[PDB]
Ligand binder design. Structure first.
Ligand SMILES: Nc1ncnc2c1ncn2[C@@H]1O[C@H](COP(=O)(O)OP(=O)(O)O)[C@@H](O)[C@H]1O
Length: 641
C-alpha cells in the first residue's frame, strides 16, 4: 500500500537462538547486532518484533533525509505529526535529536535499522543521544558489520555466532527430514553454522574451499540466474519488479524466485535486491554493459517522478559517464528537485561533488553554497562553468549571479547581470527560465528602497506559476506580494493577497504556509489597530512557531499579539505570552524576546501592581541597552496604550 512502513517479511525457515531473542526483546535502550554478511542479523531483527519500522539504509544517505523518512513515520503514528514533520519542512538543527527521542518517548514504537552507511558519525551521534536516556517505551535495534563504538552504557552488544549444530541439523530436517541425519554432521564442516550459506547448499547439490564453495555454487546456477545476478549486483538499492523487468527487456520471474529459494536474493516486501554477500562476488563477472543497464534504470526512475527516485536516478547517471545525461537531468532538477534542494543539501551535495568537473554540477554546487553563505565560492564556480552551458542554463547562471551580487550590496553589478537575461527568456520563451528571471528581478528591487517595480515583476511571475501547477511556490509569491503592498502603505491589497494564499494553503493541506499567512493576517490588522482580530490570528501563529520551535518568528508573533491583546482584551493572555517570551528569551537571547519582558511590566502596571513589579521595565532595558533597535519598539507600546 502507498505510504506505509518497509517492514520486510522474515525468512521462511528460521531456528532462532532463543537466548539472543530474549536478549534483544528484554534489552534496554539500543540493541546492536553485529556479524558478518549473511550471518542472520537482518532475519534475527525481524524475529524480534514484526511491526517494527524498518529502514534499510543504502549508499546515498543524508541524515536529514533519514530523519525526514523517520519523521514521516512519526507523523503517521500521530504523536509527532504536528511537531516533527512540520519542523522538517521548517528548518534543521541538532534539536532533531531530542525530537525523535521525544518521538518514541511518546509513541513507544520499536525501530530497526539495517546495515550501515556514509557519514556514520552523524548517525552515530544521534544514536548515542538516545541509548543513554533509556526510553521506557521506544527501542532501536541496528544490524551492522562492525561494532559502532557506541559505548556500553545502555547498549547491549549482540555478536551473532551463526547457528548451533543441533539447530543446524534441525534446520536441514525442517526442510528435508527424510534426508540422512549423518550428512548434516558433514555440512557443519563447510558452513560452520552459517545460516545463509547453509540454505545455498540445501537448495543445491554436490569438498571445496570457502571462496570456491560459493564460486563452485555459482556454476550450479542456471543461465538466467547468473545474468540476473550479474546485473542486480550493480545496484546498491532494492528495485521493484517492473523496474527489473524493464531493466532486462526480458521476463525475470523464473530466476527471481529460484534465487529467492536459495537465499541469494531478498525481498523487502515489494522490492528486490541481491544479498550483500552475493553482491561482493558477482559484481566482477560482467562489468562491460554497466552503461546500458544503468541507462535503462535511469529512464525507469525518471517515470516514477518522486524526489527519492529522483536521487536514485542521479546516482546511476554518474556511472554511465555521459555528460549529456547529466545535462538533461539537471533541467528536471529545476522542475521538481528545485523544491527540495534546500531539504536534502548534503545528499545532493555528495552526488554532485562526485562530478565536480561537470559544468552543470558546478552550477547546483554553487546554489548549495549560496544557501550556506559562501558567496565567494558560488560566484567562482559560476565563472568557471560559464561557457559550456547552453542558452537555457546561461540565464539561470546570471540570475543566481544577480542573486549572488544581491547579498553583497552590489545592485549595479546585479543589474547588469540580470540585464544579460532580459534577452534570453524572451528569445527562447521558456517557462522555467522566465520564472527565475522575474524571481530574481523582484528580489533586486526589493533590496532597493523602490517597492513599485517589484509589484509588476511578481505579477508576470505568477503568470508562469499558474501553468506548471506547483502549489508551494504559488503560495510563496502570493504571501510575498501581500508584503510589498503593505510596505507601500496599502492595506486592501495586502489583506486580500495572503487571504487567497490562505485559501490555497487550506486547500492543499499545507500547515506550514497556513500559519505563515496567519502571521501576515494578524500583523495587517495590527497596523489598522483592529485589536480583536490581530490578537486572535497571532495566538494561532504563536502556538505554531512555539510548537515548531521557530522561536524567531514565535517571538514576533507573541510580540504584536501581546500588544494588541491588552488594548481591548484581557491582560492575562498577553501576560502568558509575555512570560513565554521570557522563557524563550532566557534560552535564545533574542532581542525582541526581551521586549516581552517589559510588556510583562506593562501588564503589571495595568494589573494594579506596584513599580517593583513595573521594575521589569528596568529588568530588560539593561538587557536592551546594546541593541539600538529597542529605541524603536517603544513607538508601538505607548501609542496603542
Ligand atoms: N535462523 C535462521 N534459519 C535459517 N536461515 C537463516 C537463519 N538466520 C539467517 N538465515 C539465513 O541468512 C539470511 C539472512 O542473513 P543476514 O545476515 O541477516 O543478512 P543481512 O543482514 O546482510 O541482510 C536469510 O535469508 C537466511 O537464508
Amino acid at each position: 500500500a502507498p505510504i506505509e512502513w518497509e517492514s520486510s517479511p522474515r525468512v521462511e525457515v528460521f531456528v532462532g537462538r532463543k537466548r539472543e531473542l530474549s536478549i534483544i526483546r528484554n534489552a534496554k535502550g539500543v540493541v546492536v547486532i553485529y556479524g558478518i554478511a549473511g550471518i542472520g542479523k537482518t532475519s534475527l531483527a525481524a524475529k524480534a518484533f514484526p511491526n517494527a519500522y524498518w529502514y534499510n539504509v543504502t549508499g546515498l544517505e543524508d541524515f536529514k533525509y533519514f530523519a525526514w523518512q523517520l519523521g514521516l513515520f512519526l507523523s503517521s503514528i500521530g504523536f509527532e505529526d504536528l511537531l516533527e514533520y512540520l519542523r522538517g519542512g521548517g528548518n534543521n538543527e541538532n534539536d532533531i535529536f531530542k525530537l525523535i527521542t521525544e518521538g518514541i518517548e511518546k509513541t513507544g514504537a520499536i525501530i530497526i535499522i539495517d546495515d550501515f552507511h556514509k557519514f556514520q558519525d552523524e548517525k552515530v551521534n544521534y544514536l548515542l543521544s538516545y541509548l543513554a536516556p533509556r526510553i521506557k517505551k521506544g527501542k532501536v535495534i541496528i544490524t551492522t558489520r562492525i561494532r559502532p563504538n557506541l559505548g556500553n552504557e545502555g547498549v547491549t552488544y549482540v555478536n551473532l555466532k551463526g547457528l548451533n549444530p543441533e539447530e543446524a541439523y534441525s534446520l536441514a530436517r525442517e526442510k528435508e527430514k527424510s534426508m540422512t541425519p549423518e550428512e548434516f554432521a558433514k555440512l557443519y564442516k563447510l558452513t560452520f553454522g552459517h545460516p545463509l550459506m547453509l540454505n545455498l547448499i540445501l537448495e543445491s547439490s554436490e569438498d571445496t574451499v570457502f571462496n570456491f564453495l560459493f564460486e563452485e555454487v555459482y556454476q550450479m546456477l542456471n543461465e538466467e540466474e547468473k545474468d540476473l545476478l550479474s546485473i542486480l549486483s550493480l545496484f546498491d538499492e532494492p528495485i521493484e519488479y517492473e523496474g527489473i523487468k524493464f531493466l532486462y527487456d526480458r521476463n525475470p520471474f523464473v530466476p527471481l524466485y529460484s534465487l529467492m529459494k536459495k537465499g541469494l536474493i531478498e525481498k523487502k516486501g515489494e522490492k528486490y535486491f541481491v544479498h550483500d554477500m552475493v553482491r561482493e562476488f558477482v559484481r566482477e563477472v560482467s562489468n562491460q554493459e554497466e552503461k546500458e543497464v544503468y541507462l535503462r534504470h535511469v529512464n525507469f526512475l525518471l517515470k516514477s517522478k518522486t524526489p527519492i527516485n529522483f536521487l536514485r536516478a542521479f546516482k546511476y547517471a554518474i556511472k554511465v559517464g555521459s555528460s549529456e545525461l547529466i545535462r538533461n537531468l539537471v533541467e528536471l532538477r529545476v522542475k521538481e528537485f528545485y523544491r527540495i534542494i534546500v531539504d536534502f543539501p548534503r545528499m545532493y551535495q555528495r552526488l554532485l561533488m562526485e562530478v565536480e568537473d561537470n559544468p552543470y554540477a558546478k552550477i547546483e554546487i554553487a546554489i548549495i553554497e549560496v544557501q550556506r553563505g559562501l558567496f565567494e565560492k558560488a560566484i567562482k564556480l559560476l565563472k568557471e562553468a560559464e561557457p559550456y552551458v547552453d542558452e537555457f542554463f546561461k540565464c539561470e547562471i546570471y540570475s543566481w549571479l544577480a542573486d549572488a551580487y544581491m547579498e553583497l550590496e552590489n545592485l549595479e553589478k546585479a543589474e547588469r547581470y540580470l540585464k544579460k537575461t532580459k534577452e534570453i527568456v524572451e528569445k527562447i520563451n521558456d517557462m522555467y527560465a522566465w520564472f527565475s528571471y522575474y524571481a530574481e528581478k523582484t528580489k533586486y528591487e526589493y533590496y532597493k528602497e523602490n517597492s513599485r517595480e517589484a509589484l509588476k515583476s511578481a505579477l508576470k511571475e505568477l503568470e508562469i506559476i499558474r501553468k506548471i501547477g506547483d502549489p508551494e511556490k504559488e503560495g510563496l509569491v502570493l504571501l510575498h506580494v501581500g508584503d510589498i503592498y503593505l510596505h507601500m502603505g496599502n492595506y486592501e491589497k495586502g489583506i486580500s493577497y495572503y487571504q487567497e494564499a490562505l485559501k490555497m494553503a487550506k486547500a492543499y493541506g499545507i500547515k506550514f504556509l497556513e500559519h505563515i499567512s496567519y502571521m501576515e493576517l494578524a500583523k495587517g490588522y495590527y497596523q489598522l489597530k483592529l485589536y480583536e482580530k490581530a490578537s486572535e490570528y497571532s495566538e494561532k501563529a504563536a502556538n505554531y512557531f512555539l510548537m515548531i520551535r521557530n522561536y524567531r518568528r514565535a517571538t514576533d508573533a507573541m510580540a504584536y499579539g501581546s500588544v494588541s491583546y491588552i488594548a481591548t482584551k484581557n491582560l492575562e493572555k498577553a501576560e502568558k505570552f509575555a512570560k513565554e517570551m521570557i522563557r524563550i528569551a532566557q534560552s535564545t537571547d533574542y532581542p525582541l524576546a526581551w521586549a516581552g519582558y517589559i510588556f510583562l511590566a506593562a501588564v503589571d502596571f495595568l494589573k494594579g501592581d506596584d513599580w517593583r513589579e513595573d521594575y521589569n521595565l528596568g529588568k530588560a532595558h539593561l538587557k536592551e541597552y546594546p541593541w539600538l533597535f529597542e529605541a524603536v519598539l517603544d513607538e508601538l507600546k505607548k501609542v496603542f496604550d
